[PDB]
């Protein structure tokens, strides 16, 4: 019957999982890796990327 | 300074080339503007 205590833990865990997984979102950019973008692209619009 | 002037897009900021690589660098972010006037005949004249 200890579902109330488990609900808080599950909610916090899924919120943290969503936050950590959000880093893989492209947001329409060329790539999700900053190093590759800086290496294979000049500053003029890498800045806006 | 007098340059050939055959690269109009290179003088403006945002492009660098071989002339920018060796003769005089033209960075992609230059605050200066492009000013020109009809004086090629006087300056130009083997030589």
- B17 contacts: CB under 8 Å, gap ≥ 6: B7, B10, B26
Q: How close is the nearest chain B Cα to the Cα of A27, in Å?
A: 25
What was the resolution (in A) of this experimentally determined structure?
A: 3.0
Taking any CB pair shorter than 8 Å as contact, residues of chain B touching chain A are: 14, 28-29
Taking any CB pair shorter than 8 Å as contact, residues of chain A touching chain B are: 42-44
Tell me the C-alpha distance between B12 and B44, whole Å.
Answer: 23
Residue A28 has which token pair? 């329409």
Solved with: cryo-EM
Q: How close is the nearest chain B Cα to the Cα of A43, in Å?
A: 8
* A8-22 burial code (b ≥16 CB/10 A, e <16): eeeeeeeeeeeeeee
Q: What are the chain B neighbours of A42 within 8 Å (beta carbons)?
A: 28
- B47 contacts: CB under 8 Å, gap ≥ 6: none
């Amino acid at each position: 019957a200890l579902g109330k205590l488990q609900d808080v833990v599950n909610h916090n865990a899924q919120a943290l999982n969503t936050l950590v997984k959000q880093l893989s979102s492209k947001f329409g950019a060329i790539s999700s890796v900053l190093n590759d973008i800086f290496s294979r692209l000049d500053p003029p619009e890498a800045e806006v990327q | 300074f007098v340059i050939r002037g055959d690269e109009v897009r290179q003088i403006a900021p945002g492009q660098t080339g071989n002339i920018a690589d060796y003769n005089y660098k033209l960075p992609d972010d230059f605050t200066g503007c492009v000013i020109a006037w009809n004086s090629n005949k006087l300056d130009s004249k083997g030589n």
